[PDB]
Design a protein around this nucleic acid. Structure first.
Ligand SMILES: [Mg+2]
Ligand SMILES: [Mg+2]
Length: 132
RNA sequence: UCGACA
DNA sequence: ATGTCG
């Protein structure tokens, strides 16, 4: 019941809030299809959200109907709402991530997609294929 | 508390 | 352990 023909995304950090990165892999092979350069300050949930949105953009530009797996219940909801409810403060250090997030929201209400966004069942299946 | 993450 | 989230 794992949909192997899929794109899997995850965040990695150093600290939380701290340095954030995310990437997307082919669920079947583990091939790395995209990896975001680390962002100096962010939260886990912002990174989880950016990874799904980047996944959507990636698949849409390639005309791909694959679903996206994420392990982040929060990020899956934020994507469905088109709104990332982060508590992270706004200052010059977090400006970069907040600009990414705002641009991701903006992409979500200027585009259509039917990509299913699916919860990766870590408890059953082990770690997501995009894990750091 | 429970759930999902970092 | 603590921080991010619902
Ligand atoms: Mg994750
Ligand atoms: Mg992980």
């Amino acid at each position: 019941e794992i949909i192997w023909e899929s794109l899997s995304v995850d965040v990695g950090s150093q600290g939380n809030p701290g340095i954030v990165e995310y990437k997307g892999v082919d669920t079947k092979t583990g091939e790395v299809l995209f990896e975001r350069e680390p962002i100096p300050i962010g939260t886990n949930n912002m990174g989880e959200f950016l990874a799904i949105v980047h996944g959507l953009r990636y698949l849409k530009e390639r005309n791909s109907r694959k679903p996206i797996y994420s392990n982040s219940q929060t990020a899956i909801k934020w994507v469905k709402d088109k709104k990332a409810k982060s508590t992270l403060v706004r200052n010059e250090e977090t400006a970069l991530i907040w600009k990414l997030v705002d641009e991701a929201e903006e992409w979500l209400n200027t585009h259509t997609y039917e990509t299913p966004i699916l919860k990766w069942q870590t408890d059953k299946w082990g770690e997501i294929k995009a894990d750091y």
